[PDB]
Swiss-Prot record, chains A, B:
Subunit structure: Homodimer. Interacts with BCL2L11. Interacts with BAD. Interacts with PGAM5. Interacts with HEBP2. Interacts with p53/TP53 and BBC3; interaction with BBC3 disrupts the interaction with p53/TP53. Interacts with ATP5F1A and ATP5F1B; the interactions mediate the association of isoform Bcl-X(L) with the mitochondrial membrane ATP synthase F(1)F(0) ATP synthase. Interacts with VDAC1. Interacts with BCL2L11 (via BH3). Interacts with RNF183. Interacts with GIMAP3/IAN4 and GIMAP5/IAN5.
Entry keyword set: Apoptosis, Cytoplasm, Cytoplasmic vesicle, Cytoskeleton, Endocytosis, Membrane, Mitochondrion, Mitochondrion inner membrane, Mitochondrion outer membrane, Nucleus, Phosphoprotein, Synapse, Transmembrane, Transmembrane helix, Ubl conjugation
Outcome of substituting residue 101 to A: No effect on caspase-1 cleavage
Protein name (Swiss-Prot/TrEMBL): Bcl-2-like protein 1
Expression tissues: Bcl-X(S) is expressed at high levels in cells that undergo a high rate of turnover, such as developing lymphocytes. In contrast, Bcl-X(L) is found in tissues containing long-lived postmitotic cells, such as adult brain.
Gene symbol of the encoding locus: BCL2L1
GO biological process, one term: in utero embryonic development
Organism per entry: Homo sapiens (Human)
GO cellular component terms, A-Z: Bcl-2 family protein complex; centrosome; cytoplasm; cytosol; endoplasmic reticulum; mitochondrial inner membrane; mitochondrial matrix; mitochondrial outer membrane
Residues annotated as signal peptide: none
Motif (BH3): 31-45
């Protein structure tokens, strides 16, 4: 049973569950379904208690795998069980959801700032000279 | 009439129109509507002619505003008019849509790889030792 496949399924489920998209988007099924459901229950039961720690944690272009690995090792210090495996997937899903949110906001804000800068320096004088945006509406509404 | 407010509106409209999302998301109004509509028609008429350039250009954490400005200055070399202003908004919206798409894929696939790595190194031996994922389903599904 492929672990990479689980990861990919769980992450898309969580992204989707939280309302994320950036595109218009049997035995193996049974594992996925139970993992999704266990991740859901774990989050309902523990998100408050997990929340104080999973607040600021947001991965950036530079974050190293080793940092991730050092942090995750804490969860498994007293050994591996299914509960802790589920916590791991949920932690991953929450990391992923949090990073995407921040990174996307930063990216779109930068481009918005670029456009506003260009408008102000190069285009606003013309707009004022040619009737403002009301003339645009009149002409092209 | 605020130019920044236009930018923010146009970008949100374009992101939404393309099915982008992270998070669960009269005077001024008329300009926005006319800009949205003009941007839409511009894209329907010229997306093929643009498409050559629309495709590969994707902004990264390091892209400099000056590069953006040098490229956009070409659109306005022969002077400013409404049509070129609309083209500018659509260009910005296409840049934004394309960058978000790529950066999100990169981010999510990096976190997926991290999780898959951690599973394989630290957890897979235990999983195999304790009945595989079918035992997880029996126990917690
Ligand atoms: C991980 C865990 C496991 C169990 C457990 O109960 N494990 S279980 O008995 O195996 C089991 C039982 C039931 C089910 N499922 C049922 C579903 C039945 N439904 C079909 C009805 C219930 S839903 C459910 C319930 C529980 C688990 C799964 C699903 C399953 N399951 O599905 O796998 C398994 C209980 C509590 C905790 C737990 C929660 C929060 C923190 C924490 C720590 C702190 C150290 C980490 O440091 C960090 C601290 C803070 C932040 C960090 C961030 C990152 C890294 C480390 C961090 C430790 C620890 O000390 O390790 N433990 N926790
Ligand atoms: C910009 C443009 C404007 C018009 C125009 O027609 N302008 S218009 O007459 O003012 C007008 C008419 C109608 C409306 N609207 C109606 C809506 C009516 N509905 C109410 C029914 C029609 S929809 C509509 C239609 C048109 C515009 C808007 C909306 C409006 N309008 O709304 O604003 C205004 C026609 C064609 C083009 C045009 C298209 C594609 C490429 C290109 C270039 C190459 C750049 C080379 O530089 C670079 C070189 C190299 C690399 C580069 C990289 C990046 C940039 C530039 C680069 C140049 C150029 O070289 O300039 N021009 N183009």
């Amino acid at each position: 049973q492929s672990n990479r496949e689980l990861v990919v399924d769980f992450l898309s489920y969580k992204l989707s569950q939280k309302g994320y998209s950036w595109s218009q988007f049997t035995e193996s099924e049974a594992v996925k379904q139970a993992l999704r459901e266990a991740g859901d229950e774990f989050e309902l039961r523990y998100r408050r208690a997990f929340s104080d720690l999973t607040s600021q944690l947001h991965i950036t272009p530079g974050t190293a795998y080793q940092s991730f690995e050092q942090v995750v090792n804490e969860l498994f210090r007293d050994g591996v069980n299914w509960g802790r495996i589920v916590a791991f997937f949920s932690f991953g899903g929450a990391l992923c959801v949090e990073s995407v949110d921040k990174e996307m906001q930063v990216l779109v804000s930068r481009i918005a700032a670029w456009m506003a800068t260009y408008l102000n320096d190069h285009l606003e004088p013309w707009i004022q000279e040619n009737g403002g945006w009301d003339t645009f509406v009149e002409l092209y509404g």
